[PDB]
Curated annotation (Swiss-Prot), chain A:
Disease: Immunodeficiency 26 with or without neurologic abnormalities: A form of severe combined immunodeficiency characterized by reduced or absent T and B cells, recurrent candidiasis, and lower respiratory tract infections. Some patients show dysmorphic features, severe growth failure, microcephaly, seizures, and impaired neurological functions.
N6-acetyllysine modified-residue sites: 108
Gene designation: PRKDC
Free-text description of this protein's post-translational modifications in UniProt: Autophosphorylated at two clusters, the T2609 cluster and the S2056 cluster. Autophosphorylation induces a conformational change that leads to remodeling of the DNA-PK complex, requisite for efficient end processing and DNA repair. S-nitrosylated by GAPDH.
Compartments, as annotated in UniProt: Nucleus; Nucleus, Nucleolus; Cytoplasm, Cytosol
Family listed: Belongs to the PI3/PI4-kinase family.
Source organism (scientific name): Homo sapiens (Human)
Protein name: DNA-dependent protein kinase catalytic subunit
Quaternary structure annotation from Swiss-Prot or TrEMBL: DNA-PK is a heterotrimer of PRKDC and the Ku dimer (composed of XRCC6/Ku70 and XRCC5/Ku86). Formation of this complex may be promoted by interaction with ILF3. Component of the core long-range non-homologous end joining (NHEJ) complex (also named DNA-PK complex) composed of PRKDC, LIG4, XRCC4, XRCC6/Ku70, XRCC5/Ku86 and NHEJ1/XLF. Additional component of the NHEJ complex includes PAXX. Following autophosphorylation, PRKDC dissociates from DNA. Interacts with DNA-PKcs-interacting protein (KIP) with the region upstream the kinase domain.
From Swiss-Prot, chain B:
Keywords noted in UniProt: Acetylation, Activator, ADP-ribosylation, ATP-binding, Chromosome, Cytoplasm, DNA damage, DNA recombination, DNA repair, DNA-binding, Helicase, Host-virus interaction, Hydrolase, Immunity, Innate immunity, Isopeptide bond, Lyase, Methylation, Multifunctional enzyme, Nucleotide-binding, Nucleus, Phosphoprotein, Systemic lupus erythematosus, Transcription, Transcription regulation, Ubl conjugation
Listed GO CC annotations: chromosome, telomeric region; cytosol; DNA-dependent protein kinase complex; DNA-dependent protein kinase-DNA ligase 4 complex; extracellular region; ficolin-1-rich granule lumen; Ku70:Ku80 complex; membrane
Name of the protein described by the UniProt record: X-ray repair cross-complementing protein 6
Residue location of crosslink Glycyl lysine isopeptide (Lys-Gly) (interchain with G-Cter in SUMO2): 246, 276
Full protein: residues contained: 34 to 534 of 609
Enzyme Commission number, as recorded: 3.6.4.-, 4.2.99.-
Origin organism lineage: Eukaryota, Metazoa, Chordata, Craniata, Vertebrata
UniProtKB/Swiss-Prot annotation, chain C:
Record's subcellular location: Nucleus; Nucleus, Nucleolus; Chromosome
Residue ranges of domain Ku in the record: 1-179
Residue(s) carrying Phosphothreonine: 262
Modification note: ADP-ribosylated by PARP3. Phosphorylated on serine residues. Phosphorylation by PRKDC may enhance helicase activity.
Subunit details: Heterodimer composed of XRCC5/Ku80 and XRCC6/Ku70; heterodimerization stabilizes XRCC5 protein. Component of the core long-range non-homologous end joining (NHEJ) complex (also named DNA-PK complex) composed of PRKDC, LIG4, XRCC4, XRCC6/Ku70, XRCC5/Ku86 and NHEJ1/XLF. Additional component of the NHEJ complex includes PAXX. Following autophosphorylation, PRKDC dissociates from DNA, leading to formation of the short-range NHEJ complex, composed of LIG4, XRCC4, XRCC6/Ku70, XRCC5/Ku86 and NHEJ1/XLF. (Microbial infection) Interacts with human T-cell leukemia virus 1/HTLV-1 protein HBZ.
Family note: Belongs to the ku80 family.
Cross-link position per record: Glycyl lysine isopeptide (Lys-Gly) (interchain with G-Cter in SUMO2): 259, 261
Shown residues within the full chain: 274 to 541 of 732
Domain remark text: The EEXXXDDL motif is required for the interaction with catalytic subunit PRKDC and its recruitment to sites of DNA damage. The VWFA domain interacts with the KBM (Ku-binding motif) found in a number of DNA repair proteins.
More about this protein: Individuals with systemic lupus erythematosus (SLE) and related disorders produce extremely large amounts of autoantibodies to XRCC6 and XRCC5.
Disulfide bonds: none
Protein's name in the database: X-ray repair cross-complementing protein 5
Record-listed Phosphoserine modification sites: 45
Length: 188, 493, 268
DNA sequence: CAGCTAATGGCCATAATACCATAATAATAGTTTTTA
DNA sequence: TAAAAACTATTATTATGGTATTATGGCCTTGGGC
């Protein structure tokens, strides 16, 4: 609630631009998210908290162009990929939702890559990527896998983020469906 | 790093008024001054940020929530409709409407204003250095009534200068250009001159460009056994624009176009693997790796080597090509080339001798033979530096340099000419300068962009002479070129 | 040539071309087709929407060509560094009716006596360009011309806060090393007086001694062109002969190369 | 025609572009320290 | 055992260039018995 109210509210006023305001916001409610934790009350209370801030930020920073909010998705995306391990499962709504979500966060790097942040962008999406993965999907991922495996198939980029260059190339391997696997191991 | 520069207009009352004078309110003159530097940083395109604020007035624009202020804009590198947004403010209709619509003049209090604009130095979120501010006032008397305001001037003033933050008052014509000397110090805050006006500002920055830059730092091993690291510097690059940027049509927005290689036969892709770097001639196509190419450069490494000592006068121009930009040998990191490099230049210049090097550009190259003249160190009383101590980075001449140039006979002149020719040139000569020299015909386009910047009719359409002025040509010298013309010839041109 | 970037495994350029791939800007920023776009910028904080049209029209220029003396000056205030450019024009007559080439010589020696330099517009002819630059007579007795070159343009001077080397007050040794390594500077003087023609033959005498990039490649060219793929091809030291000065000078540097290390230490 | 055109054969400068490649800064992590 | 900071170093940042490259750049060359 203060989690949820303070997040959707202050984060909402932030839709006129936030800068430090949002980020620390993202920090405190995000960071003081888990350090304040209890089974029952706080565990599943979060489960809805996390749940509906998912539904939020997909919208929120999806809209948000880059600006402050490249750094807002520093704060978040870090808190995201680390909040994967929070729920190994009960992911399914947020499995798929975050699936094409962070897909489009690759896309948000695709708007503007590089600088300092967009590194942090795709990088944080990468650990966002796998510990997420239970298998449990087929072409919800595989679809993504395809032209991820294009998006990294190419694209001279910084020395730093180059993990993505290879990032999903075997992660698509953990996606068992053949013919894309064919595509890659031919290509790779 | 990308710094602060600040416009401000004083207000007591009559300032936005014209003093009932029949030209302009010097307030407005200031207006176009603001225009001029903010616009100026279109051209110069300076990551320095600019300030537009007034005070001393009826209503307010601020966050400090006090009487007699207005913000105009927060610190910025400019904007086109930041320009336009401010462009309302010329003209008596815009004088007034600007005034009243914002409200114009009641009272003020001085150092209050200080930390006003200073507290626009609050506005810094980024890396700036220069704290530089300008007040626009004819005010002869800040006040006589409360000299506690005066103590406040002499009080917070020293703070704000001590803040490293610097405002002065240029000589903006209160009568005499000002008649006041008297108490004025507080109001205000490599050998040059100073000016009282904007015109200097205007033209001076019409073509102007970047200032603080030194980046990629190489080395010179002198021998194998001893060290210097060499600062690479551009006196200029033959400065050019930031070049045409991709923005799509109605969307107006950056394309974020990308490029890679599809297969150009089959609908597939292509990869740097899948290709290579070739030379082809005649029958034989020959293909060798982009790597193989890029390391075929390899001889040593980026870095430099004293290769010897040569008469400076040995080569003046039999020759010339792509310039030295100026490497200053670094001495902080590696000093003693403080001393070493010092006496080096001392005596090598004394010898009229120079240090040849083989320069190896960045991420290797094939390196090249280039002389280094020792560059002398020129400073006057206030230290005009024409010759920052260093080296002339002197490309050597090579085959390509001489790849071709003709030779044949030459038929020669007579002193009968030179008797006149000399003074003729004395009429054709000018003492020249360091300054007002460019290729404006490119400047004219960031004029053409000054257009959309102001969104107006015709550019500044300013004046440099890169083209000769006929009245002087036919004036000082005259037609004596006739004498020359019929000297040896009835030309018919 | 560019290092022709074409195919591997075939070499056939048929598969070969790069990807246009023009995109939209943001929020999936997807493909855009029909390459045409406006031609614009950001500058400052401001996007600079604009076209190629308003460019072309709004652009003042030269005509198709011209070359016009912009004036003259003495050479005293003038500096080699402040000779700028790369391309340089030996300029000879349109002759046959050579008269104004002779009077040209007249103005030339009107320049050379008084150390006089030329200030001239130059618009290159064949296709549509304005330019402006310095030009100056060079004198080598048998034949001479004026050379068009770029006048360094007022922006062209970068200048720093640099504290003077005129201040050595933090750095001085005893001269007693400095003089000696001067004598080195002689032993390392590349051009010393030779032939008693007062032609000091600069070891590394520039000139007929080329630069690698081409030479280097050329060895790559005979090798790989004429022999199969290999690692680094012969660097044959005639290469490095050129690269490195002669060791009578260098030998004469050796013990001075010693006095370097000895007399002149290092830090870091 | 008159002379063959005259756009054919050629194409150099550019500007543009690219790659492509750093400091100006600001981070990472980092391996030690014992603590436990 | 790790386990704590930890000031250190790293490699991370571009803004800014320079290469290097593209492209034709609007021109000089080619043609045929009437």
């Amino acid at each position: 609630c203060s989690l949820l109210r303070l997040q959707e509210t202050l984060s909402a006023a932030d839709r006129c631009g936030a800068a430090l305001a949002g980020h620390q916001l993202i920090r405190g409610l995000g960071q003081e998210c888990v350090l304040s934790s209890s089974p029952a009350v706080l565990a599943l209370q979060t489960s809805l908290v996390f749940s509906r801030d998912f539904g939020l930020l997909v919208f929120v920073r999806k809209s948000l162009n880059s600006i402050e909010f490249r750094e807002c998705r520093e704060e978040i995306l870090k808190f995201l990929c680390i909040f994967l391990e929070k729920m190994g499962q009960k992911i399914a709504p947020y499995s798929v939702e975050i699936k094409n979500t962070c897909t489009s966060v690759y896309t948000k790097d695709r708007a503007a890559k590089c600088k300092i942040p967009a590194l942090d962008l795709l990088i944080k999406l990468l650990q966002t990527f796998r510990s997420s993965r239970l298998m449990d999907e087929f072409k919800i991922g595989e679809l993504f896998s395809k032209f991820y495996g294009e998006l990294a198939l190419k694209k001279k980029i910084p020395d730093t983020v180059l993990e993505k260059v290879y990032e999903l190339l075997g992660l698509l391997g953990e996606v068992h469906p053949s013919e894309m696997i064919n595509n890659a191991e031919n290509l790779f | 790093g990308r710094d602060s520069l600040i416009f401000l207009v004083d207000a007591s009352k009559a300032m936005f008024e014209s003093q009932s004078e029949d030209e302009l309110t010097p307030f407005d003159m200031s207006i176009q001054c603001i225009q001029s530097v903010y616009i100026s940083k279109i051209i110069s395109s300076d990551r320095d940020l600019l300030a537009v604020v007034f005070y001393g007035t009826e209503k307010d624009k601020n966050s400090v929530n006090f009487k007699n202020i207005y913000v105009l804009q927060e610190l910025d590198n400019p904007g086109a409709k930041r320009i336009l947004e401010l462009d309302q403010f010329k003209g008596q209709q815009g004088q007034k409407r600007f005034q009243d619509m914002m409200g114009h003049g009641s009272d003020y209090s001085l150092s209050e204003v200080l930390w006003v604009c200073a507290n626009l130095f609050s506005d810094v979120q980024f890396k700036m250095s220069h704290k530089r501010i300008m007040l626009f006032t004819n005010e002869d008397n800040p006040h006589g009534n409360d000299s506690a305001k005066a103590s406040r001037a002499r009080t917070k003033a020293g703070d704000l200068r001590d803040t490293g933050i610097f405002l002065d008052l240029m000589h903006l014509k209160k009568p005499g250009g000002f008649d006041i000397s008297l108490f004025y110090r507080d109001i205000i805050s490599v050998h040059f001159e100073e000016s009282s006006k904007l015109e200097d500002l205007l033209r001076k920055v019409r073509a102007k460009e970047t200032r603080k830059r030194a980046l990629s730092r190489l080395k010179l091993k002198l021998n194998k056994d001893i060290v210097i690291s060499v600062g690479i510097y551009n006196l200029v690059q033959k400065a050019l624009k930031p070049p045409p940027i991709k923005l799509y049509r109605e969307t107006n927005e950056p394309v974020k176009t990308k490029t890679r290689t599809f297969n150009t036969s089959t609908g597939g892709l292509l990869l740097p693997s899948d290709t290579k770097r070739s030379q082809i001639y005649g029958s034989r196509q020959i293909i060798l790796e982009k790597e193989e190419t890029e390391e075929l450069k390899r001889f040593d490494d980026p870095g430099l080597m004293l290769m010897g000592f040569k008469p400076l006068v040995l080569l003046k121009k039999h020759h010339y090509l792509r310039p030295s930009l100026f490497v200053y040998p670094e001495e902080s990191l590696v000093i003693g080339s403080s001393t070493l490099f010092s006496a080096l230049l001392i005596k090598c210049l004394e010898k009229e001798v120079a240090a040849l090097c083989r320069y190896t550009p960045r991420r290797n190259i094939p390196p090249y033979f280039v002389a280094l003249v020792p560059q002398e160190e020129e400073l006057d009383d206030q230290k005009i530096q024409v010759t920052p101590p260093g080296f002339q980075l002197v490309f050597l001449p090579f085959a390509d340099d001489k790849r071709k140039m003709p030779f044949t006979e030459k038929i020669m002149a007579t002193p009968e000419q030179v008797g006149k020719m000399k003074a003729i040139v004395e009429k054709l000569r000018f003492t020249y300068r360091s300054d007002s020299f460019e290729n404006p015909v490119l400047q004219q386009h960031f004029r053409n962009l000054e257009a959309l910047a102001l969104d107006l009719m015709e550019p500044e359409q300013a004046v440099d002479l890169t083209l000769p002025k006929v009245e002087a040509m036919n004036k000082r010298l005259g037609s004596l070129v006739d004498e020359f013309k019929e000297l040896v010839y009835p030309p018919d041109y | 040539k560019t290092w022709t970037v074409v195919d591997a495994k075939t070499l056939k350029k048929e598969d070969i071309q790069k990807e246009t791939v023009y995109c939209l800007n943001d929020d999936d920023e997807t493909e855009v087709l029909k390459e045409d776009i406006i031609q614009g910028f950001r500058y400052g904080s401001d996007i600079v929407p604009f076209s190629k049209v308003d460019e072309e029209q709004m652009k003042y220029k030269s005509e198709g060509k011209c070359f016009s003396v912009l004036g003259f000056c003495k050479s005293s205030q003038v500096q080699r560094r402040f000779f700028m450019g790369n391309q340089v024009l030996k300029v000879f007559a349109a002759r046959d009716d050579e008269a104004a080439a002779v009077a040209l010589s007249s103005l030339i020696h009107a320049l050379d006596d008084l150390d006089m330099v030329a200030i001239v517009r130059y618009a290159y002819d064949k296709r549509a360009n304005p330019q402006v630059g310095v030009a100056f007579p060079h004198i080598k007795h048998n034949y001479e011309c004026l050379v068009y070159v770029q006048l360094p343009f007022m922006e062209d001077l970068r200048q720093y806060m640099f504290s003077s080397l005129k201040n050595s007050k933090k750095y001085a040794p005893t001269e007693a090393q400095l003089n000696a390594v001067d004598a080195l500077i002689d032993s390392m003087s590349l051009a010393k007086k030779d032939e008693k023609t007062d032609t000091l033959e600069d070891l590394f005498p520039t000139t007929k001694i080329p630069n690698p990039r081409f030479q280097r490649l050329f060895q790559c060219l005979l090798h790989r062109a004429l022999h199969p793929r290999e690692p680094l091809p012969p660097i044959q030291q005639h290469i490095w002969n050129m690269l490195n000065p002669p060791a009578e000078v260098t030998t004469k540097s050796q013990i001075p190369l010693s006095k370097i290390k000895t007399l002149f230490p290092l830090i870091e």
